[PDB]
Design a protein around this ligand. Structure first.
Ligand SMILES: *[C@H]1C=C(C(=O)[O-])C[C@@H](O)[C@@H]1O
Ligand SMILES: *[C@H]1C=C(C(=O)[O-])C[C@@H](O)[C@@H]1O
Lengths: 252, 252
């Protein structure tokens, strides 16, 4: 399988990489959070733009990005606007969404952008080519906050993400039973063993799916999310505890 | 489901209980190991009698048990002679095996005894009635050090163990692939959700199955084994790391 080297970090090799989400309401909050996160240990920083209230102005969004970039100029930065249909904080037009993403790619402020699969094939394809031309990596995603589809269906989505040029497919699902957690781990393993030719990120959310956030090295998930102060999705545990379990499982 | 309360410990409720194995070649070794183990934190102590080289004498075996009992009079004590066909250190006659077990039960020195399922139905049934009449609990076991049978076959064995009166069925299997580890977790969940009416202990051995020793609370295994100095079976990790992962997963 291929790996993705962002800055000095190699994704898809070794212990799963830890990603934390920064969530600020405005530039002052973003600024305060970026300075607080400097005292935490993680590998990739994801800025959840949907939590930013001034998304209406491209200049405000780019300015908040520059503030983050200045506080942690070494940390790979993932630019993520999570739409409300997929568990995010806000709803915006596809065109505004694409504009924010192309502008982030253009500015040279971010290392990766998150592009939702169901945005539309033609638009995602176009944005992917744009990201790559600017040397930016694409984490293509899909989230189901209500249930866990079959392993076969999840495997089909991850393969479609690869076909559309995603550098790192990502899928999050909501378990309704412990059985659903096993289905997610199974889909991850089949993906890693037979179809994946690049790093993949998967997770089962909520308390029941917590194990999927820890067993990444065993079943095939190249990165996992932990919480610094507050969680960006249900199930995330503190980064320090997440880091401890990963090392224990890695040196076992 | 029913729980098993050994001393002050409730098995089948809460965080999975940690069991460590004491392995001494002779009375002096057993004595040295028992005093060393006092500085470790675990819930149940399992004495692996098959590692004891003076098993020919019932008096020696009972004397080694009294030494352990005196060093840790509060810790639930599991008496286990593991035959070589199931990964143990020695081979003995069924009659000698039953004699050691009945003598251990008689002495009032142990809280639980391990009885292998494939010893013979009539003998296990008789030894089970004997253990119970003396208020001793039976951990009925089966181990496959070469492969992982189907989930349905594993579920069959665990149910047979319950039918023969086992207080705590236990099954250990060897994974040949990561898929085998998933089969073990699946069998554990099916068992806990549909058939189990008492605590069950399961595990997938080796490095690949390590996750099954950590995810007990999620899938249904009431106890897990950790190593103090040396492992009594492949895959066991240090008790302190095992204890850390269990608490993290428990408070998640
Ligand atoms: C994708 C999924 C998340 C999770 O399940 O941990 C975190 C979000 O911030 C991501 O964008
Ligand atoms: C049963 C199984 C073991 C394991 O797999 O950890 C430990 C042995 O000591 C037991 O008797």
């Amino acid at each position: 399988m291929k790996t993705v080297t962002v800055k000095n970090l190699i994704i898809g090799e070794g212990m799963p990489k830890i990603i934390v989400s920064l969530m600020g309401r405005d530039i002052n909050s973003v600024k305060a959070e970026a300075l607080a996160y400097r005292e935490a240990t993680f590998d990739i920083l994801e800025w959840r733009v949907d939590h930013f209230m001034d998304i209406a102005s491209t200049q405000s969004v780019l300015t908040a990005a520059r503030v983050i970039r200045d506080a942690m100029p070494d940390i790979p930065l993932l630019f993520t606007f999570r739409s409300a249909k997929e568990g995010g904080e806000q709803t915006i037009t596809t065109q505004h969404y694409l504009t924010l993403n192309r502008a982030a790619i253009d500015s040279g402020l971010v290392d990766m952008i998150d592009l939702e699969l169901f945005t539309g094939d033609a638009d995602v394809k176009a944005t992917v080519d744009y990201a790559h031309a600017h040397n930016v990596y694409v984490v293509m995603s899909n989230h189901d906050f209500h249930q866990t589809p079959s392993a076969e269906e999840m495997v089909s989505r991850l393969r479609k993400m690869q076909a559309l040029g995603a550098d790192i497919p990502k899928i999050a699902v909501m378990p309704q039973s412990k059985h659903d957690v096993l289905t997610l781990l199974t889909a991850t393993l089949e993906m890693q063993q037979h179809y994946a030719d690049r790093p993949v990120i998967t997770m089962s959310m909520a308390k029941e799916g917590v194990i999927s956030r820890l067993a990444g090295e065993v079943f095939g998930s190249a990165a996992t999310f932990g919480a610094v102060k507050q969680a960006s999705a249900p199930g995330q545990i503190a980064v320090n505890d997440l880091r401890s379990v990963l090392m224990i499982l890695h040196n076992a």
